[PDB]
Amino acid sequence: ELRVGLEESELWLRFKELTNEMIVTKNGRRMFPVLKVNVSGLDPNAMYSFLLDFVAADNHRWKYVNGEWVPGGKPEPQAPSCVYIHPDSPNFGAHWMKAPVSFSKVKLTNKLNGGGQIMLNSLHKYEPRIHIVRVGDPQRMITSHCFPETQFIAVTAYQNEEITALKIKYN
Template identity: 70%
Template sequence: MASLHSRMFPVLKVSVSGLDPSSMYSFLLDFVPADGCRWKFVNGEWVAAGRAEGRGEGRSHGGIYIHPDSPNFGAHWMKAAVTFNKVKLTNKVNGGGQ
């Protein structure tokens, strides 16, 4: 039996041009929290669910996600849209790569 899979957010896709085809590049996302709250989806809407974990001094981002094809040549990144379809979000400080 196949499991149903739904996405909370659309997949991020970017078209890349102007890179040196023979140079190596890495693509990543840096998540920046909009506020100090944890959020959860309840009855069709987002509601605050307390204070966020690990928002100590000096922590200005929510985590970095490195595209699994990184590093790779410019030619690779320019041949098709770069798609971040494996990104997962979590409220946990150590989300195991999520």
């Protein structure tokens, strides 16, 4: 049975408790915490690619008001479908299962300017999603998982000072 487990879930939950925020910039910013998963139940002999995208969570944006996140207006039109291919792709099932798979190099941006970055809209909430795509498959089988503990609001600058301090504490 294929299982994709979130690593450092307790750490992600510390951020989610406060409402997590990830900075987006013109040139792109890596995430903290880094999305990392453990994988079991692939065919060790088969080859697969791992991909990452970000799903919009709401039909509205958010705003930080009097120290609380609240519905903050109408949403902007959806960000373009950006997909990040894990740089180890394609690789054997045995490779992906021998140690956690880490998406440490992905960068989030608010400006489409190449570099394999992910475009997000500031003040909107997103949920990371990991896809496993089997290589050489005429049926193009793909298996997707979402990670609820990793939801975050994209921001140009941190709003909650507790988030600013958590990012410094754990990173």
